[model samples]
Target chain A: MVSKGEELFTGVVPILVELDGDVNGHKFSVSGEGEGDATYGKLTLKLICTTGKLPVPWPTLVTTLLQCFARYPDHMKQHDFFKSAMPEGYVQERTIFFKDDGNYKTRAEVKFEGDTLVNRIELKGIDFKEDGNILGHKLEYNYNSHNVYITADKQKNGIKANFKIRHNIEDGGVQLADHYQQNTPIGDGPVLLPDNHYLSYQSALSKDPNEKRDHMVLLEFVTAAGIT
Target chain B: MVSKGEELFTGVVPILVELDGDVNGHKFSVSGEGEGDATYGKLTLKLICTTGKLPVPWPTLVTTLLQCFARYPDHMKQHDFFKSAMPEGYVQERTIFFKDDGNYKTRAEVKFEGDTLVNRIELKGIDFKEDGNILGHKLEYNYNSHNVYITADKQKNGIKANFKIRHNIEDGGVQLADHYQQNTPIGDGPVLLPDNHYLSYQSALSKDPNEKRDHMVLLEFVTAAGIT
Candidate 1:
């Protein structure tokens, strides 16, 4: 008799304790200073949109590359992931500023549980490459902190080790091989598994480069009831 | 009867030994990465140039500051400072990098003995106003690592702190002022000289902002030594 709570809450799943079920997350106001000291965009998983609202805004866009870390095991050994808790609250903080080119700026910060792991994250005031077009938007997610997965890029089908080669698309010359060549991403740290609960590695991005794959967690359970 | 060697080499004076001797002091290097998300400078004072080359450089400019720390009676105190037979031979392994603006970049190391204090010091490569014009150069003399007197712009009379200002021209408005304006240019801690040994204090830089004055420290000594 395999139960759900034991495996889902404290087992293989990463734990994200919620402070408030209804409040969801938050949007922060970032302040900056100095000249020639501005920061550029960091291609991290934090940019993927969520399912909630402004404050508690749900993630809207779950790009395929977003699940690279969480889905690594699923494609190789057939594992799954499950979300246990969601964001409870948020707070205000400052951002780092850097140099000024002809275009936009970027800044970011992550919410943490003491020193355990990152929960909700924020990034704002980012400018685009096109001239005369400046957009400043924030992204927040109700992440199930424990469930990690491998990611599929537009070019590379699935990559385990995080490397710069993932974003080197233009140099590779093949249009289909763009995602793998264009980005240079460094993994945060080693992934951890819960005591007895199992997390089958799930692919967050789609296996087919052409498919519109949203950010997702594939949960492989013995029974369908184990998912909810 | 206290002998000259007994009086000078016995107290907190030993800490200044390597700085006084004819042989000079150690060699050191300095270098560090910028801090604050690469926004600000991380002042890591590493020991690069040591002693006896073209000029006798201290482990670092900060070493000159840390060496000053030894005399603070509340911290190292006299009894403990003298009891330790070991010469204050510290191989400072630190690296302080510069921030955005130009840094007063100079490297120095000293091979000094505890007996004689450095009566003269010179700093080159110093600059202030945007133009390449060099700021006023500083000259100093110390007695018992106290009663530090300085003079710049040789034309102006040297100002001795009767406990008022040490150098005649206030802080000389350059690198010296940057260092002197902090918590009592002595050390990181406190000095416990009895009220009797207590020197005089006066604002070399006029306490009145309405009056044209600069910040300066002039230490006083009761003895009328032939300083000139």
Candidate 2:
């Protein structure tokens, strides 16, 4: 059992958050509760993958979401180090949903099993439609590790594609970094978001198109008390 | 549409393969298809995640399976390069199953949609029975981009855990590389397995008991004739 306030954000309750990014040309936001204390209590994350933005691939959007969470704990740790406080471990029960121009799309329920962070996700109808293609997708990840698996039920111009990836993060990271660095300005410098949070990107593209590519960007949100 | 031989392996009809590795002293082999030609025709891959192997995590075993296929075409590419032949794109229709000792376990059917590689997976009744926990799982990944997802329905000592992972490979790579380099001897050397393939490993332990650790390894097999 974890003690209260021994968590990643002790006393730093009500941390404000605001984040924004794009895939291809499609804009998205990862915003919600920015406060943390003994626990996240009940945190809600809202994502916008509105239509009419470039048709971003699913992998790119997913990478951004994971990074959004991974950065928080890291930022809190830095703050703890500066204050000479025992770093708090964080346990969050978060519910997130993705929307398109204010329409419900997919949902994710994130929680912990012992020490593991599991993100349970479900897709309704065709959340992502591009080039006459309708995609029904589901995703899950151990936020603490590279145990990422994906499933896509795609009907492209009336053709079906059932795709899966069993990939290690090491190889995936290289690809993610490359894409971000080559295509985005963030690649050239440290990305500082609206909050005092720091951001970074990593991406990789496969030389073989059939093999595929991976891309990711992360934002580390910290409070004034969090930084050393 | 991708023409038959316009795919990888035009003239080379049958190809042969053999691979072996370990996880904490547990031995696993990725050996099959001792024959191939212009096309893999029907390629079969066998993986042994046997018991008494220090209970390797699911991600580690799955990574090896993906690498097993990645190496095949890579080796074929090198073979083609030497002959100055137009590189070919190889599309495969593969069915893979995992077992422990002699017990049958999980299975996956992989196919392609136009230019995409899809893996559809399902778990057996108690495929992941570890620490007295019975986990029924399913996974999917699109090799072309960030579409990776997983679902786990578990009965832990009759307790329940409906776990999922929604992650893209882009961010997972850094963690994967760190794990591979720190624990495996392959970090310092070229892991050339049977049939012109290379392998490597990566893993990290989670500080949280509920948040499980992530671990994975990869194999690179390239042939000159296998690329376009």
Candidate 3:
């Protein structure tokens, strides 16, 4: 419990990585990033493509999904962050929607048992898993982006997933300051769920004042997702 | 009321302006460079000279404040959208504290009444309104160039005041953006009460992927402050 006039918060490390690839003449966006390490179980995976892209390689997608979770030796416990936060271990998964590019959406979900973490990719129809006993609990997600909505289990903190345009991603555009508390790309992949990194309070533009940019599409979120 | 999963939040037009200032004889830090026109009210000053710059001219300080809040009417609000949220009936005031350029500090409360959209200055050495109808709720103040705190009637919101460094009087340097809603400036005069422009959750900072600040000071608030 927090008292009046005092601030309570936790901090965690974050990593971001993105890669584009082609599987048998079908273009796909493959990306993975996580917070912490093998020491503690935590990870997130995302993949997207022009929806209904013909000649979809479902097998490759499944392979990638398995490989992603395999990286975490203790996927089950680490993923508990999601289960414990929820009642009866109910998780809701949904597809990505964006006003700018809703036609092309991505989908994924996580389901864990007493000691396991299961992640599924909708389009490719693949399932991945790991041990949940090692990971502690999954913080909730708060989603508020350029209008993206995510339905996750125990969404105490809402979660939003959308492509944030890094118009200034390169040097000389808007050199982002290294202040890793409120403004940075660290709120993605595995790190976002491991810690209560994002919240719905101040506008994202205020988080990093020095960031010079025309625009950036951010998958905004908050932990402990729902409250009246 | 809003549910936790409710994605979009309704934005509102505001009626008060909070001023986040610094008096180190250098550039001042302001809240709304573009929100609304800040007004002046009866003085209930919470002044601190973090560096011990005592004997800081009161008149000059007020003049500087006048210059600071004067941005809205002069059309500086075009670029600073924060000022764009201002409504009407907002007020601002000042109280001066002297730091002896050493370690000694002396602070007093100045209270007054009325709704002056703008004013010259409040009388010195008083902490309550003579009329008692519109008095400045007085309290203790703790200040630092980078961090400061002020306590007053927990109910007021339109205007919140704090201490932070002012590399200039613009939106670049660091200050508490979430503490108050839209802080116009001190051009408008005093009103008996604070209004909508008071800082709220919209301006609070969170651990977003995009925003990661280094440190923060906490706030002790009362239910009377009207925050949910």
Candidate 4:
């Protein structure tokens, strides 16, 4: 079992820990930051949400995508990633930020164990479109205060990865879409996401005149190696 | 000799390094980021600009003041600071940020080597007053964008601690004080500031009704140990 007891009581708000253990057949669980030994076999998971294609440049977000090699030249030199051009289609691009009360937001609930996959109970796509009528050729959205969140979890169904997403739709408007959760099922036991990699769920906003989905939202799980 | 060469080539703009050694009587220097090697004996110095009292909590600031032991309980358990109620009168409080065009701002320059100190050439006090005639009981200032800067310098005169401070006064007005630099000199070569500590220079904004200065501005040098 891989567990880090330090970050558990680090006395900081943003807590992150890696938990892995057995619960003696009983259902074991770990929520948010920390938990004692699991009653059953469980793993730790942390998810980062963002949209768009791979290897996208981000500022004021996660450091993994921002000149990471330069930050750790020594550590990077010993790894293969340093020798090649940046890998693409990785989907570990930027972290999406909103007030969780804005017009665009995404949410997810993932369950995983070791390298094997599991269930994604819920992955919701909130009001991506503005709240006003699609007057001629424009959509309106409320002023948003971009923000972020982070945490980890270990649950009975493997380890549930949970996080927040902007979702506010009080004012009456016509440009709103039914807040629906993704229906894509892993189907099989595990959808493997090797180390330093992530899985994606794309929710498109619309199809342009050419019948092409232009606005896409991606909520991903950037496993261990991908975060540090 | 003490030095950290990685930060020099980290490829990040804001670079911080530690340099110390003998110059063989000639002269050694290290600019903002990186230099092959020093010509003479020089120590690296990083300065964090801030003001105010001791142990004041800072939200978005140098983590040193934010969370400490909590972030590194293991490493902190061995240190005395963890057992005791935080040290007082250290003056490593909050960082000062402004557009450099604000009404009130502070600046400084420090020189140090090993445990001893050399000189503090200049500590300027920009127009600390709002540009306008002082009314009955109110003062006016312009819009300011609180920002920050960082770097290191090694010169002939020991290691110099240099940083940026807001300073701007274009349109003339009555609320203006002479743009004079601090006159207090170290007058000694070896003002020692141990690890995890900093030195301060207080610049008062005004001598109030009781003829006692209240609005105090501090420009400090948080040594290596004091920084991280």
Candidate whose lDDT is highest: 2
lDDT tens readout by residue for model 1, B7-82 = 3334332112112212122222222111010011011111222322312222113222222222222222232211
- Among all windows of 10 consecutive residues in model 3 chain A, the one with the lowest summed lDDT is A133-142
Across residues B58-146, which tens digit of lDDT does each residue of candidate 3 receive? Answer: 22232122112211221222222222222232344433322211111112111112222222222233222232211211111111112
True contacts kept of each: 0.00, 0.00, 0.17, 0.00
What ranges in model 1 sit over 4 Å off?
Answer: A1-228, B1-8, B11-71, B74-88, B91-102, B106-228
- Residue-level lDDT tens digits of model 2 in A1-228: 112213533433333333344322345544332222232211222233333232333343433232223223433433221112112111111222223311123333333334333333333222344421112222211112222111111211011111112322321331121111011111222222222322222222212224222222222211122133
DockQ of the two-chain complex in candidate 3: 0.08
> Taking chain A of candidate 1, what TM-score results?
0.22
Which segments of candidate 2 are over 4 A away from where they belong?
A1-44, A50-55, A62-228, B1-55, B58-228
Stretch of 10 with least lDDT, candidate 1 chain A: A33-42
Prediction 1 global C-alpha lDDT: 0.20
Regarding DockQ, does 3 or 4 come out ahead?
3
Instruction: State the DockQ, from 0 to 1, for candidate 2.
Output: 0.03
User: By descending TM-score, how would the candidates be arranged?
Assistant: 2, 3, 4, 1
> What TM-score does candidate 1 get on C-alpha atoms?
0.17
Q: B66, model 3: CA deviation in Å?
A: 14
Q: CAPRI band of model 4?
A: incorrect
Estimate the TM-score of every prediction. 0.17, 0.24, 0.24, 0.22
Error of 1 at B198 (Å): 17
Docking class of 3: incorrect
The best-first sequence of candidates by DockQ reads: 3, 2, 4, 1
For model 3, give the RMSD to the true fold: 20.6
